[PDB]
Nucleic acid binder design. Structure first.
Lengths: 69, 414, 412, 69, 71, 71
DNA sequence: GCTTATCCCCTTAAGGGGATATATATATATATATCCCCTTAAGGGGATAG
DNA sequence: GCTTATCCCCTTAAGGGGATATATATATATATATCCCCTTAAGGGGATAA
């Protein structure tokens, strides 16, 4: 949890968690109703994923964001 | 002219009306600048300038009881100035579903912040008869009803800018109160979130009562408080008109898709579906946009509040004109053939596709579907024996008899 | 799209319905253009383009029944969008009570301007046996409008006007009630409409004639006549008929009826009817049972009185003794404005008479006349009733009236 | 500041911000390097909006995002 | 009929109007509802008579007023 | 034309001499040295207005009045 | 006896002086919302491998 | 056996360009409703000089 700025920074950061939480991709996309690959690509190349997915993840992640000055 | 809306002693904003009769809006900076800020509905989120969209008018419309039945009674009993939304409110700005307070700019005064008057055991049968055929109350919905305060064993009346606590519905069909109670208790028996309802009696009137989750007594018990809430249709900002789907309102689809934004996304959905399967085994044909509300939290957050106004259309079955065959689910289903809604012929197979289309973990639906594959034979007697002797014993042999007919689709499987 | 508004084939001004609600009218240049131009409803006088008033809505709203239980079928039988004055006046927004027509800006249609369906008995009846379980009918409770054509009634057609109003059995039996009210009502000099009852098979109903619709000299055309109610006078919604809501009563009406064509004779017939109601026992005389005539240039005269029904037919023998009866509207008094049958004695009308400076002599006269003629009237109506008229209502009402009339000869 | 759990929420908010600062929906797309249209597409229907996009906008707003538990 | 240009004529007219019919100032204010001290006063000083009093004075005599192009 | 019956029935036609004749209260009275108030007031409240005034606004409008028959 | 102009008492206030809160109508600019085009690519099914 | 990265098949729309239509804002003449101050008095009761 710090001051973000890049797409890739959010990706690395999320896995940091999903994994360290024990959870994984295989199941992630199983619950929020998406595709495995999706989380997968998005994970490594999030520069082109969209925000509508950015959130579907935050759900199967018990996590979310907000803006900050 | 400029009905200033408030939210629990907080100058939210001003609702102005132009000469031509326009329904605009503008938020007070004071409300902006707070860490808390939240729009009355996501239909009209925060911003720094007069609004103009239709929602500015819609949201306010759902506020006041939908029935023109009552509307006319409004201008009538209260010296209004038009059947227009802004007007009926201009005067009855006191009580309003959701944290709404409408009072002009000539009453910043500290009107009665807390005051009421207990009702006699007779007036409890009098005030009703008064609704059916400062009483500053307004309840939006289906037939003849209003809200009231409750303190211990009394039944006072909101006076001044003071809210209420309970809901009080009346019989319509041959019975309504008897149908509203029956359906609600079984909700707490199937893991559904519903309010605490009873059947307070007053002379010769079997009345209904409900606990408004929008109303909650703070710890201190020294001040009662409302809670900003709205129903789906409102969220976006639509008129009562398009309530039902076949008429152009939001459906199971738009819904779910909007549940994903919930601050509690997966639950609201889970339960939502669960409820859709329930409204199937009972014949709740009334499941529309103005029954599924959402709370409103700072910053734009929201979740799926308890489901209300629930009711089944099984009373007028069997030995009556309308039969279960013609009954149709409020919300549309996805089948192989366009959409299907005919409750009677709706097997899980369909629900299964649905969950499949909205991409809801099939297993998650199963857990829900399967849950109603063995809890009925029991869950029933559990609430069947929790009802007094006076309650009509012909509202149970009609609903249940049929609820176990469609239940076969679940028993012959799981 | 905006809705248009003609006045028997003339362009008046299309209204500008808007989402937000800010309804804006206008003046079909060809209406303001004619020297005999007459506004829609006094409330909405005669001026230029946009009209920044509210009476606007109000008006277009009163185009529907005051009984709210009636505003909801148009969104059903013809599948409207809403029940607002905009969606409730699209499908059946053609024939409006009075003479004004409403239709969008995309449908300048002219179906058979005239055409009648010579109904049979089973048929005539049919249409009515359905009014329980493109025209406007509303003035008391539940009533429809037909087209009396000769000896047999017939369903209208296209933008064809209605000649009558068929009041269905609502007051355990209103039909024989209002019928009586009239024959005997006009019997005392009151200028009212000559209606006649209607029978078909086994059903009974009421049949009144219009007064804002008339056959020209040669019987070729039947023009609706410009008219309106006292509500759409100062821009009010149907919820204000009585006074318990805030409507025009026997005080405001008076200040206003003064600017009439027949300023004089009208004021008279008024007070008259007033005491008329008292005696006969009518108590449903709300602000909407009054109608003027939207004459050219903007003038107005009192039309023949209507929707009269006394509570006498039902009193005491159920659960509402005589004590329980208050005149539709309120008349001045000593302790505010009394409104009690038994309390309202002659002396009262007198006082309430001088309150407005209404010619005392005249009042005296009225009270007198009725008093004296009343006796005959009743009889003349009793000896002129159908061979089955329910003697109950007959004697019931008849008796009370005399008891009231008693509060006359003993004073005048 | 304010937790968020959806596409719209995002925008509804970043919108307020823009409005607070009193800038022009135009100088944004320019000051940074993208179209002024998107600037609008984003503030009305940012759903299938580009991820990187977001930052660009964010970065202009003299703002940053953060992950909240 | 004729063209009315001043407050004097305006009434000067109505005056001759109830004389040629045999009506007194105190007998017209009756059938209408105002006094004789008004009708009269009006006659000799009709300049400051309110329009009401104006029209009303008319009702009595069964009159009607209208403008006319001043050409 | 049309027969006038009340102070109001008149105030209505007077609002035609402006919107149709272009002139406005801001000037109608500028020519007769009177206050726009009476005008504005008159337009919506023609009862309180007195005749002498009525005529200043009557003539200043290139219009004259007269009597007729109330039949 | 009948018609008519003053006057007393009194409340409301039109109307002139002098001055201000709402109105159609309008032009530099500002401006958030749309269109045909165009295309690189994301989630969607379904699915195998370094 | 399992989590994770690719990969084809495949629909659509976002973003760029350029450009435009629909708002919306600080201006700016010109215009019906008002506001407190203050002076002759007109229209109601009631009455009577002439």
């Amino acid at each position: 949890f710090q001051k973000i700025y890049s797409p890739t920074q959010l990706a690395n950061a999320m896995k940091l968690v999903r994994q360290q939480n024990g959870w994984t991709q295989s199941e992630l996309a199983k619950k929020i109703g998406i595709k495995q690959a999706t989380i997968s690509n998005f994970e490594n190349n999030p520069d082109n994923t969209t925000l509508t997915t950015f959130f579907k993840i935050l759900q199967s992640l018990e996590l979310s964001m907000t803006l900050c000055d | 002219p400029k009905l200033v809306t408030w939210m629990n002693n907080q100058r939210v904003g001003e609702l102005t009306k132009l000469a031509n009769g326009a329904h605009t809006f503008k938020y007070a900076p004071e409300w902006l600048a707070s860490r808390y800020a939240r729009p009355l509905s996501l239909s009209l989120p925060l911003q720094r300038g007069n609004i103009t969209s239709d929602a500015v008018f819609n949201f306010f419309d759902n506020l006041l009881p939908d029935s023109p039945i009552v509307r006319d009674r409004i201008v009538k009993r209260y010296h209004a100035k038009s059947r227009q939304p802004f007007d009926l409110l201009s005067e009855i700005g006191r009580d309003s579903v959701g944290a709404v307070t409408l009072i002009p700019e000539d009453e910043t005064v500290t009107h009665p912040i807390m005051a009421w008057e207990k009702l006699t055991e007779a007036r409890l049968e009098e005030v009703l008869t008064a609704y059916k055929a400062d009483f500053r109350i307004s309840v939006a919905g289906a037939q003849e009803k209003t809200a009231l305060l409750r303190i211990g064993n009394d039944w006072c009346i909101p006076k001044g800018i003071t809210p209420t606590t309970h809901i009080i519905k009346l019989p319509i069909l041959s019975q309504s109160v008897d149908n509203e109670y029956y359906c609600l208790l079984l909700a707490k028996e199937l893991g559904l979130n519903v309010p605490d309802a009873e059947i307070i009696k007053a002379g010769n009137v079997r009345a209904l009562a409900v606990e408004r989750f929008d109303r909650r007594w703070n710890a201190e018990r020294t001040v009662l408080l409302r809670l900003p809430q709205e129903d789906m249709c409102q969220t976006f900002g639509l008129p009562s008109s398009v309530k039902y789907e076949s008429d152009g309102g939001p459906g199971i689809a738009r819904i779910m898709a909007f549940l994903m934004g919930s601050s509690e996304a997966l639950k609201d959905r889970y339960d939502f579906m669960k409820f859709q399967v329930f409204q199937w085994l009972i014949g709740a044909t009334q499941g529309h946009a103005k029954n599924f509300s959402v709370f409103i939290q700072a910053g734009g957050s929201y979740r799926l509040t308890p489901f209300y106004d629930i009711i089944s259309a099984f009373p007028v079955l069997g030995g009556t004109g309308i039969h279960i065959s013609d009954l149709k689910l409020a919300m549309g289903l996805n089948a192989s053939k366009g959409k299907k809604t005919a409750i009677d012929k709706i097997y899980p197979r369909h629900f299964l596709a649905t969950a499949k289309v909205l991409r809801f973990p099939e297993v998650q639906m199963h857990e829900i579907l399967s849950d109603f594959a063995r809890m009925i034979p029991a869950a029933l007697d559990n609430v069947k024996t929790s009802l007094p002797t006076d309650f009509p014993e012909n509202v149970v042999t009609a609903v249940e008899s049929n609820v176990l007919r469609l239940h076969g689709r679940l028993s012959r499987e799981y």
